[PDB]
């Protein structure tokens, strides 16, 4: 009798508002009615789901204003919400018209409000292999994803349940990738920044980025991860780019050591195969996101990605390049410097009791328990980066900007593998400064550009802390030798270079370790004016940095 009273469109007036007497009765009291529906649940929901095509907003408000009370008083009449949910999540075939095409959007928000309630009031239970109305509600969600009618901000509370939808295999996952890609290519800007700041377009876009970060921040998936990383790679940088970095460091440390291999190897296959596209996007995976992810706290010692990269790195490294064409060349070169960056970092944050001793890493590298030193793969690495940065361009003028960055990344790999896994000063000259001049086979011509004029604004402001440094210099300069009372009483792109950091890391390790021959070589190369101005200035800034 009460359900028959409620599900009725009877018009009242305070004048011009019309305010149906189902809605107004459900506005006045709204809770003790829901205790009656608690008193007999089963006929209430079965009869409540009888008219569900006309009285759509009505019964959705009935469910919302019942689950809010069943959620808030969970401190008495316990063991209730589970049976409530596992009963109601069975008859969503009754709903077929709120979320479909030619249907109101506020009713669609109402469906997802019932969704937010059945996934807030209860736990992860109705998710596995057609447990409840999961394949009768997922299609409602998919039709609210593939529709051309929802809003750029009123999906904002509507994407947030992918944590309760990243727990699956394939089959529906393919069309999930499909609906995510189509909402991205109809709801994200094409490359970068093409919306005015302050306006409620660009701000709801950064809210969309924020809620994606909130979703994968807990829900550790490679599922959403290549989907978001493809828009993280469509340009060189983005507008909200640090937020992805903070959330990547946030997703890095959660445990789940096996899933980290999944993230690395999965976005590594999204990077790794042919996939003809532009090279910045085709390398920016391993250039930014993979390095910044596997750098911080992904896994402190991981050899499964670092077991398949044994097979999957040196095969690309030991290659030949075809220079008839650029579109076969640049892909090989970019994935080669990506592999240089990967082995750089993989030797940067690994200890020595697992990789360079006679351990299971080299037992993975070559088949059989090795008596060898562990310096076999690192010997093929060291040889080929030496070949890489000592590869001449004695007539070669094709794509020399990429080969310069390649050569410096090659030496970055070399610096990392030499600064970490041994303790003797033999290689410390022999692979770093012993550069043998047969014909053309030196270092800095081949790995430093030497091809522009560095433009300097001079000392533009703030000489504030440096005056005290100069007065302290005149303190220690006179009072140490022949100090009187006082005496006189009278009246930036060389750093951000991708080059300065590994040198000023290696020498600031090489000090605290033991005229050296490398000191003689850089002693001569700085006062020799046949040498260009460029590496003269750069090794000058080196010497200034490493005091």
């Amino acid at each position: 009798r009460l359900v028959s009273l409620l599900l009725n469109p009877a018009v009242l007036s305070t004048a011009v508002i019309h305010f149906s007497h189902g809605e107004y009765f459900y506005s006045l009291f709204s809770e003790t009615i829901n205790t009656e529906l608690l008193k007999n649940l089963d006929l209430a929901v079965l009869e409540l789901m009888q008219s569900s095509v006309d009285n759509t907003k009505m019964v959705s408000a009935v469910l919302n204003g019942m689950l809010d009370q069943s959620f808030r008083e969970r401190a008495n009449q316990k063991h209730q919400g589970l049976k409530l949910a596992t009963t109601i999540l069975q008859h969503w075939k009754k709903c077929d018209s709120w979320w479909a095409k030619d249907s109101p959007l506020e009713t669609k928000m109402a469906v997802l409000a019932l969704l937010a309630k059945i996934l807030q009031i209860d736990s992860s239970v109705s998710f596995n292999t057609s447990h409840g109305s999961f394949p009768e509600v997922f299609t409602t969600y998919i039709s609210l994803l593939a529709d051309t009618k929802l809003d750029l901000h009123l999906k904002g509370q509507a994407v947030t349940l992918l944590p309760f939808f990243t727990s699956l295999t394939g089959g529906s996952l393919e069309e999930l990738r499909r609906v995510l890609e189509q909402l991205i290519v109809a709801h994200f800007p094409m490359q970068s920044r093409e919306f005015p700041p302050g306006t409620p377009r660009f701000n709801n876009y950064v809210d969309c980025m924020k809620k994606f970060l909130d979703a994968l921040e807990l829900s550790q998936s490679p599922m959403l991860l290549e989907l978001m990383t493809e828009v993280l790679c469509r340009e060189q940088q983005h507008v909200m780019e640090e937020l992805f970095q903070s959330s990547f460091r946030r997703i890095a440390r959660r445990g789940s050591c096996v899933t980290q291999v999944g993230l690395l190897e999965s976005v590594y296959e999204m990077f790794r195969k042919d996939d003809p596209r532009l090279s910045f996007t085709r390398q920016s995976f391993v250039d930014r996101s993979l390095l910044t992810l596997l750098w911080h706290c992904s896994l402190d010692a991981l050899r499964e990605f670092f077991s398949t990269i044994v097979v999957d790195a040196i095969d690309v490294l030991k290659s030949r390049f075809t220079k008839l064409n650029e579109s076969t060349f640049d892909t090989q070169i970019t994935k080669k410097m990506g592999y240089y960056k990967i082995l750089d970092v993989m030797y940067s944050r690994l200890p020595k009791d697992d990789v360079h001793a006679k351990e299971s890493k080299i037992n993975q590298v070559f088949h059989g328990s090795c008596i060898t030193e562990g310096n076999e793969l690192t010997k093929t690495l060291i040889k080929l980066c030496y070949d890489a940065f000592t590869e001449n361009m004695a007539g070669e003028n094709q794509l020399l900007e990429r080969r310069r960055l390649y050569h410096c990344a090659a030496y970055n790999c070399a610096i990392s593998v030499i600064c970490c896994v041994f303790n003797e000063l033999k290689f410390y000259q022999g692979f770093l400064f012993s550069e043998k001049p047969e014909k053309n086979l030196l270092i800095f011509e081949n790995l430093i550009d030497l091809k522009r004029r560095y433009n300097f604004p001079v000392e533009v402001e703030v000489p504030m802390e440096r005056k005290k440094k100069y007065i302290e210099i005149r303190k220690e300069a006179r009072e140490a030798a022949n100090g009187d009372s006082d005496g006189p009483s009278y009246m930036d792109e060389l750093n951000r270079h991708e080059c300065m950091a590994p040198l000023t890391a290696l020498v600031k390790h090489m000090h605290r370790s033991l005229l050296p021959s490398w000191m003689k070589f850089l002693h001569g190369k700085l006062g020799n004016p046949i040498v260009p101005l460029n590496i003269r200035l750069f090794l000058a800034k080196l010497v200034i940095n490493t005091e």
């Binding site: 030193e373 310096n375 010997k379 040889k383 030496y386 000592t390 033999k426 290689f427 022999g430 692979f431 012993s434 043998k436 047969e438 086979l441």
Partner: peptide
């Protein structure tokens, strides 16, 4: 060139 650094290991 670097085989002088190979044989010394």
């Amino acid at each position: 060139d670097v085989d002088d650094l190979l044989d010394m290991i």
